[PDB]
Design a protein around this ligand. Sequence first.
Ligand code: BQF
Ligand code: BQF
Ligand code: BQF
Ligand code: BQF
Lengths: 294, 293
Amino acid sequence: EAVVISGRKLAQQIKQEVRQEVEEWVASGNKRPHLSVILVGENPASHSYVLNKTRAAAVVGINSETIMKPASISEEELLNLINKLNNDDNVDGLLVQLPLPEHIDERRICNAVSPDKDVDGFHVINVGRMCLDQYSMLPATPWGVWEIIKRTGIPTLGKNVVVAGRSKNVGMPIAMLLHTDGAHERPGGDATVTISHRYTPKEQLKKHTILADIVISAAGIPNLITADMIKEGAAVIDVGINRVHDKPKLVGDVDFEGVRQKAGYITPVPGGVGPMTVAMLMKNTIIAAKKVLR
Amino acid sequence: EAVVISGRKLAQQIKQEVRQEVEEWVASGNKRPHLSVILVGENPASHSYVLNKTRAAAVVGINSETIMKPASISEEELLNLINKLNNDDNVDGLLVQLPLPEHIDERRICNAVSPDKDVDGFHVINVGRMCLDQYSMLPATPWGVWEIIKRTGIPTLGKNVVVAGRSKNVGMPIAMLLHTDGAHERPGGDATVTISHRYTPKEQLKKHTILADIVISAAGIPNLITADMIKEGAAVIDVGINRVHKPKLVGDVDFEGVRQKAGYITPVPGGVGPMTVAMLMKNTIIAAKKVLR
Ligand SMILES: O=C(O)c1ccc(C(=O)N2CCc3c(c(=O)oc4ccccc34)C2)cc1
Ligand SMILES: O=C(O)c1ccc(C(=O)N2CCc3c(c(=O)oc4ccccc34)C2)cc1
Ligand SMILES: O=C(O)c1ccc(C(=O)N2CCc3c(c(=O)oc4ccccc34)C2)cc1
Ligand SMILES: O=C(O)c1ccc(C(=O)N2CCc3c(c(=O)oc4ccccc34)C2)cc1
């Protein structure tokens, strides 16, 4: 059977690194990091994600506040709020929980967050920097996937990788990190990467996955990955977060039970990539506090 | 055997569109578009590329000037010139011929060029905008590859595409254009895209090329694509520009071999190169119209 990778345990390790980095930072006489989270409306999953972020900050000695506004907020109010936070020298990291309501321009909001406080790395300049392999605030899911892979010691250079999904904050960034030059200012994994998405024909994915040492699935489709798609021994990183009902539940992209047999490594849902996303946000927040980048 | 696609011919076509578009702009009362090129040093390829660009501009009714600098120029001197041209309201497009000397930082120069004059689309905001599928000044070579494909009627949606090479102004944007959503602000290809590079093993490139409906090579490696790598009927686009031996110029494909198996193919010379220069003209009229301001 396949080694089940523990997202909880790895996220725990990263959390400890950060807790140590924050303590030393404060001991050297610096201000304790502060993370601000703007939460809009009342999406249940959002609300729980923000609690996961606030707990993680508390456990690593980073101060936080979630500012909850109602769905009804005007895009311009939101911009004012962000502008306040951007200007408050006590806020090191600012993020805006997604999705926002249909009447708010996401991209406009994401670009209003100061790049220097952009711990989500979703600002156009951080996306640009990332895509040029420069130092940047990396988005947290991609960074988490990366860490799961490196921390587990799975090789990437020369290897073959498939990423199912091409969203701009998850799939595309994963594909960008995995294929790029280990030698660049922000190293990448030098893999051979294939990006697939909703217009891949079922057969085409299969012909690609079967060739792949690593299959990273970030499509949000239960059971998109079945055991015949993977080649024996391959690492399967399941980035899917699918709420199904039976008992409302959390399931992945992968058929966990089945692929378990075929794969050399696999990651569970829940307890897989999710905890890592949250942990990498803590890394990004101490980076922000330290003003490395600007 | 392969329909050879003349990039020379398609580029002349595109230049004809641009010429009409420029004629219309001027006849409407607007300032004639002006492109400035900065050229540093003496790379002979570079000099010829600037010649190509200045000729293309002349053909399409766009004003040009090359400002040649010795390789000895400093980074700071280069930024002053760029800062000057950014501020000259007469200059609609501005490009710095690449590559630059080692003591000058490419990224920093590329980001000094005003994003609205950046007809190479290499400023970080333009890269970012492109990578988010927003309207942007698209880089000329990838846009030209896109144009070869689209005007030749080669479908992309659902297809397999390999792009060999992952450079930031050629391979990576080609992969970005080809895989992204056809529905976004800046439409992409909705293809299934595999990116390979200097560390793809030969067996591994081949295992992927063979499934490919379109293969696009931007490696700078002669005979990297051979006919047994290619699936019969596939489109093969040769981005390579390789100086071999009188001093000769070849692509990354084994043209003679590959044309016997592929359904379309592009030659070097005469394929992607002229398209690159053509798309730069389209970017310049775009810049002059201040469409994306
Ligand atoms: O209805 C079926 O019978 C059916 C089931 C599944 C597939 C499949 O395998 N797809 C389609 C969606 C998809 C794929 C992908 O690789 O990445 C995605 C990333 C994001 C969103 C959707 C995908 C590939 C095809 C047909
Ligand atoms: O054990 C777990 O499986 C698990 C632990 C933690 C999280 C979490 O809190 N996430 C990850 C997904 C996510 C987050 C988000 O903030 O916005 C999203 C917006 C859209 C889609 C997914 C997210 C943050 C999730 C799962
Ligand atoms: O005879 C050999 O020793 C040999 C020849 C060629 C390969 C090959 O196919 N390579 C390596 C270079 C390369 C590849 C690629 O896909 O993209 C590149 C994009 C940019 C630069 C170099 C590449 C793939 C392997 C072995
Ligand atoms: O007929 C042809 O095959 C052909 C026509 C025109 C051109 C040309 O002028 N190019 C394309 C390549 C290129 C250009 C450049 O400006 O910088 C480069 C910097 C590095 C690498 C390639 C370029 C501009 C090239 C070939």
